[PDB]
Design a protein around this nucleic acid. Structure first.
Ligand SMILES: Nc1nc2c(ncn2[C@H]2CC[C@@H](COP(=O)(O)OP(=O)(O)OP(=O)(O)O)O2)c(=O)[nH]1
Ligand SMILES: [Cl-]
Ligand SMILES: [Cl-]
Ligand SMILES: [Cl-]
Ligand SMILES: [Cl-]
Ligand SMILES: [Mg+2]
Ligand SMILES: [Zn+2]
Length: 562
DNA sequence: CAGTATG
DNA sequence: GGCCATACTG
Protein backbone atom coordinates (compact mmCIF):
# COMPACT_ATOMS: atom_id res chain seq x y z
CA UNK A 1 0.00 0.00 0.00
CA UNK A 2 2.26 2.81 -1.39
CA UNK A 3 -0.43 5.50 -1.11
CA UNK A 4 1.40 5.92 2.21
CA UNK A 5 4.65 6.13 0.26
CA UNK A 6 3.32 9.15 -1.59
CA UNK A 7 1.36 10.97 1.10
CA UNK A 8 4.59 10.44 2.99
CA UNK A 9 6.50 12.43 0.35
CA UNK A 10 3.93 15.24 0.38
CA UNK A 11 3.87 15.85 4.09
CA UNK A 12 7.68 15.76 3.96
CA UNK A 13 7.90 18.62 1.49
CA UNK A 14 5.35 20.46 3.56
CA UNK A 15 7.38 20.13 6.71
CA UNK A 16 10.64 21.28 5.17
CA UNK A 17 9.14 24.04 3.10
CA UNK A 18 7.21 25.22 6.19
CA UNK A 19 10.35 25.06 8.22
CA UNK A 20 12.29 27.07 5.64
CA UNK A 21 9.68 29.80 5.60
CA UNK A 22 8.32 29.61 2.10
CA UNK A 23 4.72 30.40 1.08
CA UNK A 24 2.24 29.02 3.61
CA UNK A 25 -0.42 28.28 0.95
CA UNK A 26 1.72 25.86 -0.97
CA UNK A 27 2.64 24.65 2.51
CA UNK A 28 -0.75 23.65 3.80
CA UNK A 29 -1.51 22.50 0.24
CA UNK A 30 0.85 19.57 0.70
CA UNK A 31 -0.34 18.75 4.19
CA UNK A 32 -3.88 18.35 2.86
CA UNK A 33 -2.68 16.52 -0.22
CA UNK A 34 -1.19 13.84 2.05
CA UNK A 35 -4.14 13.81 4.44
CA UNK A 36 -6.58 12.55 1.82
CA UNK A 37 -3.98 10.38 0.06
CA UNK A 38 -3.26 8.60 3.31
CA UNK A 39 -6.94 7.86 3.95
CA UNK A 40 -8.12 6.96 0.42
CA UNK A 41 -9.25 3.33 0.03
CA UNK A 42 -8.91 2.76 -3.70
CA UNK A 43 -5.45 2.90 -5.29
CA UNK A 44 -3.49 5.54 -7.13
CA UNK A 45 -2.08 2.90 -9.43
CA UNK A 46 -5.25 3.44 -11.42
CA UNK A 47 -6.20 7.12 -11.82
CA UNK A 48 -2.53 7.89 -12.44
CA UNK A 49 -3.00 5.73 -15.51
CA UNK A 50 -6.35 7.41 -16.27
CA UNK A 51 -5.46 11.01 -17.19
CA UNK A 52 -5.48 14.04 -14.93
CA UNK A 53 -8.99 15.53 -14.73
CA UNK A 54 -10.21 12.37 -12.95
CA UNK A 55 -7.14 12.63 -10.64
CA UNK A 56 -8.16 16.15 -9.62
CA UNK A 57 -11.67 14.94 -8.64
CA UNK A 58 -9.89 13.97 -5.41
CA UNK A 59 -10.21 16.82 -2.93
CA UNK A 60 -7.05 18.79 -2.18
CA UNK A 61 -5.67 17.67 -5.55
CA UNK A 62 -4.74 20.03 -8.31
CA UNK A 63 -2.48 20.97 -11.25
CA UNK A 64 0.69 22.33 -9.58
CA UNK A 65 0.58 19.13 -7.53
CA UNK A 66 -0.75 17.00 -10.40
CA UNK A 67 2.55 17.57 -12.27
CA UNK A 68 4.26 16.08 -9.21
CA UNK A 69 2.11 12.92 -9.15
CA UNK A 70 3.58 12.74 -12.64
CA UNK A 71 7.14 13.31 -11.43
CA UNK A 72 6.47 10.44 -9.01
CA UNK A 73 4.13 7.68 -10.32
CA UNK A 74 5.05 8.31 -13.95
CA UNK A 75 8.81 8.99 -13.45
CA UNK A 76 9.61 7.60 -9.94
CA UNK A 77 11.13 10.29 -7.62
CA UNK A 78 10.15 13.92 -6.59
CA UNK A 79 12.61 16.62 -7.74
CA UNK A 80 11.48 19.30 -5.23
CA UNK A 81 11.61 16.88 -2.27
CA UNK A 82 15.16 16.13 -3.26
CA UNK A 83 16.05 19.83 -3.55
CA UNK A 84 14.46 20.44 -0.16
CA UNK A 85 16.22 17.48 1.42
CA UNK A 86 19.43 18.91 0.03
CA UNK A 87 18.85 22.12 2.00
CA UNK A 88 17.36 20.37 5.10
CA UNK A 89 18.95 17.45 7.05
CA UNK A 90 17.02 14.29 7.89
CA UNK A 91 18.45 15.06 11.29
CA UNK A 92 16.37 18.17 11.49
CA UNK A 93 13.34 16.52 9.91
CA UNK A 94 13.03 14.02 12.78
CA UNK A 95 13.00 17.07 15.02
CA UNK A 96 9.82 18.43 13.39
CA UNK A 97 8.24 14.98 13.48
CA UNK A 98 8.57 15.23 17.24
CA UNK A 99 5.12 16.01 18.63
CA UNK A 100 5.15 19.48 20.18
CA UNK A 101 7.95 20.62 17.94
CA UNK A 102 7.08 20.96 14.25
CA UNK A 103 8.62 23.14 11.51
CA UNK A 104 8.64 26.64 12.95
CA UNK A 105 9.51 25.58 16.52
CA UNK A 106 12.06 23.27 14.99
CA UNK A 107 13.58 26.20 13.16
CA UNK A 108 13.37 28.40 16.17
CA UNK A 109 15.33 25.75 18.08
CA UNK A 110 17.85 25.15 15.35
CA UNK A 111 18.76 28.75 14.82
CA UNK A 112 18.38 29.12 18.57
CA UNK A 113 20.67 26.38 19.82
CA UNK A 114 22.05 24.74 16.68
CA UNK A 115 19.74 21.78 17.33
CA UNK A 116 19.89 19.58 14.24
CA UNK A 117 18.95 16.09 15.43
CA UNK A 118 17.26 14.09 18.14
CA UNK A 119 20.26 13.48 20.37
CA UNK A 120 21.12 17.16 19.94
CA UNK A 121 17.61 17.77 21.20
CA UNK A 122 17.59 15.28 24.03
CA UNK A 123 20.75 16.85 25.43
CA UNK A 124 19.56 20.41 25.17
CA UNK A 125 16.36 19.05 26.67
CA UNK A 126 18.26 17.92 29.74
CA UNK A 127 19.25 21.65 30.33
CA UNK A 128 8.36 32.50 23.54
CA UNK A 129 9.57 29.13 24.88
CA UNK A 130 8.29 28.63 28.41
CA UNK A 131 9.28 25.84 30.83
CA UNK A 132 5.93 24.15 30.11
CA UNK A 133 6.29 24.36 26.31
CA UNK A 134 9.67 22.70 26.85
CA UNK A 135 8.30 20.01 29.17
CA UNK A 136 5.47 19.60 26.66
CA UNK A 137 8.21 18.68 24.18
CA UNK A 138 9.59 16.07 26.56
CA UNK A 139 6.10 14.65 26.89
CA UNK A 140 6.05 14.27 23.12
CA UNK A 141 9.46 12.74 22.87
CA UNK A 142 8.01 10.14 25.22
CA UNK A 143 4.79 9.16 23.46
CA UNK A 144 7.02 9.20 20.40
CA UNK A 145 9.12 6.40 21.86
CA UNK A 146 6.56 5.03 24.37
CA UNK A 147 4.01 4.40 21.59
CA UNK A 148 6.85 3.49 19.14
CA UNK A 149 6.12 1.34 16.07
CA UNK A 150 2.74 0.12 17.34
CA UNK A 151 0.20 1.39 14.81
CA UNK A 152 -3.43 2.31 15.08
CA UNK A 153 -5.85 -0.39 13.83
CA UNK A 154 -7.59 1.53 11.07
CA UNK A 155 -4.27 2.69 9.67
CA UNK A 156 -3.84 -0.76 8.28
CA UNK A 157 -7.17 -2.49 8.47
CA UNK A 158 -8.23 -2.39 4.87
CA UNK A 159 -4.62 -3.45 4.11
CA UNK A 160 -5.05 -6.53 6.36
CA UNK A 161 -8.19 -7.29 4.36
CA UNK A 162 -6.13 -6.65 1.22
CA UNK A 163 -3.91 -9.56 2.30
CA UNK A 164 -6.55 -11.95 3.61
CA UNK A 165 -8.18 -12.29 0.27
CA UNK A 166 -4.72 -12.74 -1.27
CA UNK A 167 -3.87 -15.43 1.37
CA UNK A 168 -7.19 -17.22 1.14
CA UNK A 169 -6.94 -17.33 -2.66
CA UNK A 170 -3.44 -18.84 -2.69
CA UNK A 171 -3.21 -22.48 -3.64
CA UNK A 172 -3.08 -24.76 -0.55
CA UNK A 173 -5.10 -22.44 1.67
CA UNK A 174 -8.49 -23.92 2.63
CA UNK A 175 -9.47 -21.41 5.32
CA UNK A 176 -7.70 -18.30 6.68
CA UNK A 177 -8.54 -15.41 9.07
CA UNK A 178 -6.78 -12.34 10.48
CA UNK A 179 -6.43 -12.79 14.26
CA UNK A 180 -4.56 -11.40 17.27
CA UNK A 181 -4.77 -7.73 18.05
CA UNK A 182 -6.72 -6.93 14.86
CA UNK A 183 -9.50 -9.47 15.38
CA UNK A 184 -9.77 -8.39 19.01
CA UNK A 185 -10.37 -4.81 17.77
CA UNK A 186 -7.71 -3.25 20.10
CA UNK A 187 -7.17 0.44 19.24
CA UNK A 188 -3.44 -0.03 18.60
CA UNK A 189 -1.73 -2.95 16.80
CA UNK A 190 1.90 -4.12 16.64
CA UNK A 191 1.68 -6.70 13.89
CA UNK A 192 -0.81 -8.64 11.86
CA UNK A 193 -1.38 -12.14 13.24
CA UNK A 194 -2.79 -14.44 10.54
CA UNK A 195 -3.87 -18.11 10.54
CA UNK A 196 -4.23 -20.58 7.68
CA UNK A 197 -5.84 -24.05 7.77
CA UNK A 198 -3.66 -26.24 5.47
CA UNK A 199 -2.56 -29.83 5.09
CA UNK A 200 0.29 -28.82 2.79
CA UNK A 201 1.72 -25.64 4.29
CA UNK A 202 5.03 -25.46 2.46
CA UNK A 203 2.97 -24.06 -0.45
CA UNK A 204 1.20 -21.86 2.07
CA UNK A 205 4.30 -20.46 3.84
CA UNK A 206 6.59 -20.73 0.80
CA UNK A 207 4.30 -18.55 -1.42
CA UNK A 208 3.11 -16.47 1.59
CA UNK A 209 6.38 -14.55 1.53
CA UNK A 210 6.24 -14.25 -2.26
CA UNK A 211 3.43 -11.62 -2.11
CA UNK A 212 3.92 -8.16 -3.83
CA UNK A 213 3.38 -6.33 -0.51
CA UNK A 214 6.62 -7.74 0.96
CA UNK A 215 9.80 -5.85 1.43
CA UNK A 216 12.02 -8.23 3.44
CA UNK A 217 11.80 -11.84 4.65
CA UNK A 218 12.89 -12.58 8.22
CA UNK A 219 11.83 -16.22 8.79
CA UNK A 220 10.66 -19.18 6.68
CA UNK A 221 9.23 -22.61 7.47
CA UNK A 222 6.64 -25.19 6.51
CA UNK A 223 4.13 -24.39 9.27
CA UNK A 224 4.94 -20.64 9.70
CA UNK A 225 6.72 -17.43 8.50
CA UNK A 226 7.44 -13.71 9.42
CA UNK A 227 7.55 -10.73 6.98
CA UNK A 228 8.44 -7.00 7.19
CA UNK A 229 6.34 -5.08 4.59
CA UNK A 230 7.17 -2.22 2.12
CA UNK A 231 5.12 -0.02 4.47
CA UNK A 232 6.98 -0.89 7.72
CA UNK A 233 4.75 -3.45 9.44
CA UNK A 234 5.15 -7.05 10.52
CA UNK A 235 2.71 -9.78 9.50
CA UNK A 236 3.21 -13.27 10.86
CA UNK A 237 1.76 -16.58 9.63
CA UNK A 238 0.82 -19.85 11.42
CA UNK A 239 -0.44 -22.95 9.59
CA UNK A 240 -2.42 -25.48 11.77
CA UNK A 241 -4.07 -28.30 9.84
CA UNK A 242 -7.74 -28.42 8.88
CA UNK A 243 -8.95 -30.50 11.89
CA UNK A 244 -7.44 -27.89 14.22
CA UNK A 245 -8.39 -24.62 12.46
CA UNK A 246 -10.62 -23.77 15.43
CA UNK A 247 -7.96 -24.04 18.13
CA UNK A 248 -5.69 -22.34 15.56
CA UNK A 249 -8.02 -19.39 15.62
CA UNK A 250 -8.18 -19.48 19.39
CA UNK A 251 -4.40 -19.54 19.98
CA UNK A 252 -3.67 -16.94 17.28
CA UNK A 253 -6.32 -14.61 18.60
CA UNK A 254 -5.36 -15.11 22.21
CA UNK A 255 -5.16 -12.86 24.04
CA UNK A 256 -2.36 -14.22 26.22
CA UNK A 257 -4.46 -13.18 29.21
CA UNK A 258 -7.60 -14.77 27.80
CA UNK A 259 -5.99 -17.91 26.38
CA UNK A 260 -4.48 -18.57 29.85
CA UNK A 261 -7.83 -18.56 31.72
CA UNK A 262 -8.94 -20.94 28.98
CA UNK A 263 -6.08 -23.44 29.12
CA UNK A 264 -6.53 -23.38 32.95
CA UNK A 265 -10.18 -24.49 32.59
CA UNK A 266 -8.97 -27.41 30.46
CA UNK A 267 -6.54 -28.25 33.30
CA UNK A 268 -8.99 -28.20 36.24
CA UNK A 269 -11.55 -30.05 34.03
CA UNK A 270 -9.10 -32.89 33.15
CA UNK A 271 -8.55 -31.50 29.60
CA UNK A 272 -5.87 -29.85 27.49
CA UNK A 273 -6.43 -26.81 25.27
CA UNK A 274 -3.78 -26.11 22.63
CA UNK A 275 -3.52 -24.55 19.16
CA UNK A 276 -4.42 -27.97 17.84
CA UNK A 277 -7.31 -28.93 20.07
CA UNK A 278 -8.77 -29.76 23.45
CA UNK A 279 -8.03 -33.21 24.77
CA UNK A 280 -8.72 -35.99 27.15
CA UNK A 281 -5.64 -38.19 26.64
CA UNK A 282 -4.66 -38.50 22.94
CA UNK A 283 -8.27 -38.00 21.82
CA UNK A 284 -8.88 -34.54 20.48
CA UNK A 285 -12.33 -33.65 21.83
CA UNK A 286 -12.49 -30.43 19.75
CA UNK A 287 -10.73 -28.38 17.02
CA UNK A 288 -12.66 -28.54 13.72
CA UNK A 289 -14.27 -25.12 14.50
CA UNK A 290 -14.04 -22.44 17.13
CA UNK A 291 -17.41 -22.69 18.79
CA UNK A 292 -17.00 -26.46 18.67
CA UNK A 293 -14.05 -25.93 21.05
CA UNK A 294 -15.44 -23.22 23.40
CA UNK A 295 -18.44 -25.51 23.75
CA UNK A 296 -15.95 -28.30 24.51
CA UNK A 297 -14.63 -26.30 27.56
CA UNK A 298 -18.21 -25.77 28.70
CA UNK A 299 -18.58 -22.20 27.48
CA UNK A 300 -20.64 -20.09 25.05
CA UNK A 301 -18.48 -18.74 22.15
CA UNK A 302 -16.85 -15.51 23.38
CA UNK A 303 -16.33 -12.58 20.90
CA UNK A 304 -12.81 -11.58 20.06
CA UNK A 305 -13.46 -8.04 21.42
CA UNK A 306 -14.30 -9.52 24.80
CA UNK A 307 -11.22 -11.82 24.89
CA UNK A 308 -9.18 -10.03 27.55
CA UNK A 309 -9.46 -11.75 30.92
CA UNK A 310 -11.59 -8.97 32.36
CA UNK A 311 -14.84 -10.84 33.02
CA UNK A 312 -15.74 -12.63 29.78
CA UNK A 313 -14.52 -16.03 31.09
CA UNK A 314 -16.45 -15.71 34.37
CA UNK A 315 -19.63 -14.40 32.75
CA UNK A 316 -19.47 -17.21 30.11
CA UNK A 317 -19.86 -19.67 32.97
CA UNK A 318 -23.33 -18.33 33.87
CA UNK A 319 -24.58 -17.66 30.32
CA UNK A 320 -24.26 -14.00 31.41
CA UNK A 321 -22.20 -12.96 28.36
CA UNK A 322 -23.57 -9.49 27.65
CA UNK A 323 -25.65 -8.40 24.66
CA UNK A 324 -23.54 -6.37 22.25
CA UNK A 325 -24.04 -3.78 19.58
CA UNK A 326 -23.74 -4.92 15.96
CA UNK A 327 -22.87 -2.93 12.82
CA UNK A 328 -26.32 -3.78 11.49
CA UNK A 329 -27.95 -1.82 14.36
CA UNK A 330 -26.27 1.58 13.77
CA UNK A 331 -28.75 3.92 12.18
CA UNK A 332 -26.43 6.89 11.77
CA UNK A 333 -23.21 8.80 12.26
CA UNK A 334 -23.09 11.39 14.98
CA UNK A 335 -20.27 13.67 13.89
CA UNK A 336 -19.04 14.54 10.42
CA UNK A 337 -17.75 17.69 8.81
CA UNK A 338 -18.52 19.83 5.79
CA UNK A 339 -17.09 22.84 4.05
CA UNK A 340 -18.54 25.29 6.61
CA UNK A 341 -15.42 24.30 8.56
CA UNK A 342 -12.39 21.99 8.12
CA UNK A 343 -14.61 19.36 6.37
CA UNK A 344 -14.01 18.85 2.61
CA UNK A 345 -17.62 18.23 1.54
CA UNK A 346 -20.73 19.93 0.27
CA UNK A 347 -23.92 18.68 1.89
CA UNK A 348 -25.08 16.70 -1.15
CA UNK A 349 -21.91 14.68 -1.07
CA UNK A 350 -22.37 14.06 2.63
CA UNK A 351 -26.01 13.06 2.10
CA UNK A 352 -25.41 10.71 -0.81
CA UNK A 353 -22.69 9.09 1.20
CA UNK A 354 -25.04 8.33 4.18
CA UNK A 355 -27.60 6.94 1.84
CA UNK A 356 -25.40 4.29 0.21
CA UNK A 357 -24.02 3.64 3.70
CA UNK A 358 -27.58 2.95 4.73
CA UNK A 359 -28.15 5.42 7.51
CA UNK A 360 -31.47 6.77 8.72
CA UNK A 361 -29.76 10.03 9.69
CA UNK A 362 -26.57 12.06 9.93
CA UNK A 363 -25.31 15.08 11.97
CA UNK A 364 -23.16 17.63 10.13
CA UNK A 365 -21.34 18.83 13.21
CA UNK A 366 -18.96 21.53 11.99
CA UNK A 367 -16.65 23.40 14.39
CA UNK A 368 -17.23 26.49 16.47
CA UNK A 369 -14.53 29.13 16.04
CA UNK A 370 -12.47 28.19 19.11
CA UNK A 371 -10.30 26.10 16.78
CA UNK A 372 -8.66 28.03 13.86
CA UNK A 373 -8.01 31.38 15.73
CA UNK A 374 -15.68 30.16 10.91
CA UNK A 375 -18.60 29.82 11.32
CA UNK A 376 -19.80 32.98 13.02
CA UNK A 377 -22.82 33.00 15.31
CA UNK A 378 -24.63 34.46 12.27
CA UNK A 379 -23.05 32.11 9.70
CA UNK A 380 -24.10 29.48 12.19
CA UNK A 381 -27.72 30.55 11.79
CA UNK A 382 -27.50 30.72 8.01
CA UNK A 383 -25.92 27.28 8.01
CA UNK A 384 -28.83 25.92 10.09
CA UNK A 385 -31.15 27.61 7.63
CA UNK A 386 -29.35 26.18 4.60
CA UNK A 387 -29.52 22.71 6.13
CA UNK A 388 -33.16 22.93 7.27
CA UNK A 389 -34.10 24.44 3.88
CA UNK A 390 -31.88 21.80 2.23
CA UNK A 391 -33.52 19.05 4.26
CA UNK A 392 -36.93 19.39 2.67
CA UNK A 393 -35.58 19.96 -0.85
CA UNK A 394 -34.31 16.34 -0.43
CA UNK A 395 -35.72 13.01 0.84
CA UNK A 396 -34.18 11.04 3.71
CA UNK A 397 -31.80 10.48 5.42
CA UNK A 398 -32.15 13.56 7.62
CA UNK A 399 -29.06 15.77 8.06
CA UNK A 400 -29.20 16.97 11.66
CA UNK A 401 -27.86 20.52 11.92
CA UNK A 402 -25.21 20.14 14.59
CA UNK A 403 -21.93 21.53 15.85
CA UNK A 404 -18.72 20.53 17.64
CA UNK A 405 -18.49 23.32 20.19
CA UNK A 406 -15.28 24.00 22.02
CA UNK A 407 -15.09 24.27 25.77
CA UNK A 408 -13.54 27.45 27.08
CA UNK A 409 -11.03 26.98 29.88
CA UNK A 410 -13.44 28.48 32.43
CA UNK A 411 -15.99 25.80 31.26
CA UNK A 412 -18.16 28.23 29.30
CA UNK A 413 -19.05 27.12 25.76
CA UNK A 414 -17.89 28.62 22.48
CA UNK A 415 -21.20 29.55 20.92
CA UNK A 416 -24.00 31.11 22.91
CA UNK A 417 -27.23 29.78 24.29
CA UNK A 418 -29.01 31.94 21.78
CA UNK A 419 -27.48 29.99 18.91
CA UNK A 420 -27.50 26.59 20.48
CA UNK A 421 -31.28 26.78 20.68
CA UNK A 422 -31.58 26.37 16.87
CA UNK A 423 -29.35 23.35 16.56
CA UNK A 424 -30.29 19.74 16.16
CA UNK A 425 -27.21 18.46 17.90
CA UNK A 426 -24.71 19.95 20.24
CA UNK A 427 -21.30 18.38 20.60
CA UNK A 428 -18.80 19.59 23.16
CA UNK A 429 -15.16 18.65 23.26
CA UNK A 430 -12.03 20.38 24.44
CA UNK A 431 -9.27 21.56 22.07
CA UNK A 432 -7.40 23.67 24.55
CA UNK A 433 -5.12 23.49 27.60
CA UNK A 434 -5.21 19.74 27.91
CA UNK A 435 -3.02 19.71 30.97
CA UNK A 436 -4.53 21.21 34.03
CA UNK A 437 -4.52 19.15 37.20
CA UNK A 438 -7.06 16.35 36.99
CA UNK A 439 -9.64 17.87 39.37
CA UNK A 440 -9.39 21.44 38.06
CA UNK A 441 -9.67 20.09 34.54
CA UNK A 442 -12.59 18.21 36.16
CA UNK A 443 -14.25 21.47 37.13
CA UNK A 444 -13.98 22.52 33.49
CA UNK A 445 -15.89 19.53 32.21
CA UNK A 446 -18.56 19.82 34.91
CA UNK A 447 -18.74 23.54 34.18
CA UNK A 448 -19.28 22.66 30.53
CA UNK A 449 -21.79 19.99 31.62
CA UNK A 450 -23.88 22.71 33.27
CA UNK A 451 -25.47 24.04 30.02
CA UNK A 452 -28.77 22.25 29.18
CA UNK A 453 -28.64 22.47 25.39
CA UNK A 454 -25.63 20.08 25.53
CA UNK A 455 -26.26 16.69 23.87
CA UNK A 456 -23.02 14.66 23.29
CA UNK A 457 -19.63 14.88 24.89
CA UNK A 458 -17.41 14.41 21.86
CA UNK A 459 -14.05 12.73 21.66
CA UNK A 460 -13.79 13.17 25.40
CA UNK A 461 -10.14 12.63 26.28
CA UNK A 462 -8.66 14.43 23.25
CA UNK A 463 -6.30 11.48 22.93
CA UNK A 464 -4.42 11.70 19.65
CA UNK A 465 -2.66 8.41 19.13
CA UNK A 466 1.08 8.53 19.40
CA UNK A 467 0.77 12.29 19.52
CA UNK A 468 -1.04 13.31 22.68
CA UNK A 469 -1.68 11.44 25.85
CA UNK A 470 -5.26 11.38 26.92
CA UNK A 471 -6.30 14.26 29.07
CA UNK A 472 -6.59 13.82 32.84
CA UNK A 473 -9.93 14.00 34.75
CA UNK A 474 -12.23 12.38 37.35
CA UNK A 475 -14.30 10.57 34.77
CA UNK A 476 -15.96 8.75 37.58
CA UNK A 477 -17.51 12.15 38.38
CA UNK A 478 -17.81 13.32 34.79
CA UNK A 479 -19.97 10.48 33.47
CA UNK A 480 -21.81 10.78 36.77
CA UNK A 481 -22.73 14.37 35.87
CA UNK A 482 -23.49 13.21 32.33
CA UNK A 483 -25.80 10.44 33.42
CA UNK A 484 -27.76 12.83 35.65
CA UNK A 485 -28.14 15.49 32.95
CA UNK A 486 -29.24 13.13 30.14
CA UNK A 487 -25.92 13.83 28.33
CA UNK A 488 -24.30 11.21 26.02
CA UNK A 489 -20.65 10.28 25.48
CA UNK A 490 -18.84 9.73 22.23
CA UNK A 491 -16.83 6.95 20.76
CA UNK A 492 -14.98 8.64 17.95
CA UNK A 493 -14.02 5.92 15.55
CA UNK A 494 -11.48 7.99 13.64
CA UNK A 495 -8.34 5.97 13.71
CA UNK A 496 -5.90 8.53 15.01
CA UNK A 497 -8.04 9.24 18.02
CA UNK A 498 -10.41 6.95 19.81
CA UNK A 499 -12.12 8.87 22.52
CA UNK A 500 -13.79 7.17 24.21
CA UNK A 501 -11.42 4.23 24.32
CA UNK A 502 -12.26 0.65 25.44
CA UNK A 503 -11.58 0.94 29.20
CA UNK A 504 -13.33 4.30 29.60
CA UNK A 505 -16.19 3.32 27.32
CA UNK A 506 -16.97 0.30 29.46
CA UNK A 507 -16.90 2.19 32.74
CA UNK A 508 -19.28 4.84 31.50
CA UNK A 509 -21.89 2.68 29.75
CA UNK A 510 -21.86 0.58 32.89
CA UNK A 511 -22.38 3.67 34.96
CA UNK A 512 -25.86 4.08 33.43
CA UNK A 513 -24.79 6.58 30.64
CA UNK A 514 -25.91 6.91 26.99
CA UNK A 515 -23.40 6.84 24.08
CA UNK A 516 -22.76 8.65 20.78
CA UNK A 517 -20.77 7.00 18.06
CA UNK A 518 -19.09 8.72 15.13
CA UNK A 519 -16.29 8.85 12.62
CA UNK A 520 -15.42 12.58 12.76
CA UNK A 521 -15.37 12.10 9.06
CA UNK A 522 -13.75 14.96 7.19
CA UNK A 523 -13.74 13.31 3.79
CA UNK A 524 -16.39 10.82 2.53
CA UNK A 525 -14.11 7.76 2.87
CA UNK A 526 -13.80 8.27 6.63
CA UNK A 527 -17.33 6.92 7.25
CA UNK A 528 -16.00 3.40 6.88
CA UNK A 529 -14.41 3.83 10.27
CA UNK A 530 -17.74 3.13 11.94
CA UNK A 531 -17.30 -0.53 12.97
CA UNK A 532 -14.00 0.64 14.36
CA UNK A 533 -16.04 2.36 17.04
CA UNK A 534 -18.67 -0.42 17.24
CA UNK A 535 -15.78 -2.81 17.67
CA UNK A 536 -14.57 -0.61 20.53
CA UNK A 537 -18.04 -0.51 21.97
CA UNK A 538 -18.25 -4.26 22.00
CA UNK A 539 -14.99 -4.37 23.99
CA UNK A 540 -16.59 -2.05 26.60
CA UNK A 541 -19.37 -4.65 26.92
CA UNK A 542 -22.06 -2.41 25.33
CA UNK A 543 -25.50 -3.38 24.04
CA UNK A 544 -27.72 -1.46 21.60
CA UNK A 545 -29.48 -0.08 24.62
CA UNK A 546 -28.51 3.49 25.51
CA UNK A 547 -26.78 4.08 22.19
CA UNK A 548 -28.12 7.14 20.38
CA UNK A 549 -27.01 5.70 17.01
CA UNK A 550 -29.31 2.70 17.44
CA UNK A 551 -32.41 4.99 17.62
CA UNK A 552 -34.45 6.05 14.54
CA UNK A 553 -34.52 9.71 13.43
CA UNK A 554 -37.84 10.43 15.19
CA UNK A 555 -37.05 8.59 18.42
CA UNK A 556 -33.68 10.27 18.63
CA UNK A 557 -35.31 13.60 17.99
CA UNK A 558 -37.79 12.81 20.73
CA UNK A 559 -34.86 12.04 23.04
CA UNK A 560 -33.12 15.25 21.97
CA UNK A 561 -35.79 17.40 23.69
CA UNK A 562 -36.47 15.29 26.82
C1' DC B 1 20.42 -32.47 24.23
C1' DA B 2 18.27 -29.18 27.77
C1' DG B 3 16.88 -24.23 28.83
C1' DT B 4 15.24 -20.46 27.38
C1' DA B 5 12.77 -17.39 24.61
C1' DT B 6 8.51 -16.77 21.61
C1' DG B 7 3.75 -16.52 19.19
C1' DG C 1 2.91 -15.74 36.79
C1' DG C 2 -0.41 -18.26 36.01
C1' DC C 3 -0.20 -22.28 29.43
C1' DC C 4 1.20 -25.27 26.08
C1' DA C 5 3.86 -26.03 21.55
C1' DT C 6 8.03 -24.39 18.84
C1' DA C 7 12.91 -22.50 17.09
C1' DC C 8 17.02 -20.47 18.37
C1' DT C 9 21.60 -20.58 21.45
C1' DG C 10 24.62 -23.26 22.91
N1 LIG D 1 -0.53 -19.96 24.57
C1 LIG D 1 0.12 -18.78 24.40
N2 LIG D 1 -0.23 -17.98 23.36
C2 LIG D 1 0.39 -16.79 23.17
C3 LIG D 1 1.45 -16.38 24.10
N3 LIG D 1 1.89 -15.18 23.68
C4 LIG D 1 1.18 -14.86 22.57
N4 LIG D 1 0.29 -15.82 22.27
C5 LIG D 1 -0.64 -15.77 21.15
C6 LIG D 1 -1.78 -14.88 21.63
C7 LIG D 1 -1.73 -13.68 20.69
C8 LIG D 1 -1.01 -14.24 19.46
C9 LIG D 1 -0.52 -13.16 18.45
O1 LIG D 1 0.69 -12.46 18.76
P1 LIG D 1 0.79 -10.90 19.11
O2 LIG D 1 1.15 -10.85 20.58
O3 LIG D 1 1.71 -10.39 18.06
O4 LIG D 1 -0.67 -10.25 18.82
P2 LIG D 1 -1.58 -9.49 19.95
O5 LIG D 1 -1.35 -10.20 21.28
O6 LIG D 1 -3.02 -9.46 19.52
O7 LIG D 1 -1.10 -7.93 19.99
P3 LIG D 1 -0.17 -7.27 18.84
O8 LIG D 1 -0.49 -7.92 17.50
O9 LIG D 1 -0.39 -5.79 18.77
O10 LIG D 1 1.16 -7.68 19.40
O11 LIG D 1 -0.04 -15.17 20.00
C10 LIG D 1 1.78 -17.29 25.22
O12 LIG D 1 2.69 -17.00 26.06
N5 LIG D 1 1.09 -18.45 25.29
CL1 LIG E 1 -3.97 -0.72 25.13
CL1 LIG F 1 -31.72 -3.06 14.25
CL1 LIG G 1 -27.04 33.76 25.54
CL1 LIG H 1 -36.38 26.30 24.09
MG1 LIG I 1 2.66 -11.45 16.84
ZN1 LIG J 1 -12.79 17.11 16.78
Amino acid sequence: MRNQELARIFEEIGLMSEFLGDNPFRVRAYHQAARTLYDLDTPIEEIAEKGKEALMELPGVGPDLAEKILEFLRTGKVRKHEELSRKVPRGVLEVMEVPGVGPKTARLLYEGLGIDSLEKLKAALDRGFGPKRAERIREGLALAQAAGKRRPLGAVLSLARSLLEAIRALPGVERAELCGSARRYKDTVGDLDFLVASREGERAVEGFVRLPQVKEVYAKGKERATVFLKNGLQVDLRVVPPESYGAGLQYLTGSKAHSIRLRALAQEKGLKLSEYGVFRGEKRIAGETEEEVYAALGLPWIPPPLREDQGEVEAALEGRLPKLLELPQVKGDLQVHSTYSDGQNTLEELWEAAKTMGYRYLAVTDHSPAVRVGPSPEEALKRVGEIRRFNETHGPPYLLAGAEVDIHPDGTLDYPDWVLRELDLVLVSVHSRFNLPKADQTKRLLKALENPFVHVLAHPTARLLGRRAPIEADWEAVFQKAKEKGVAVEIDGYYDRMDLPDDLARMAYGMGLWISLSTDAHQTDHLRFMELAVGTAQRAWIGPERVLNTLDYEDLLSWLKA
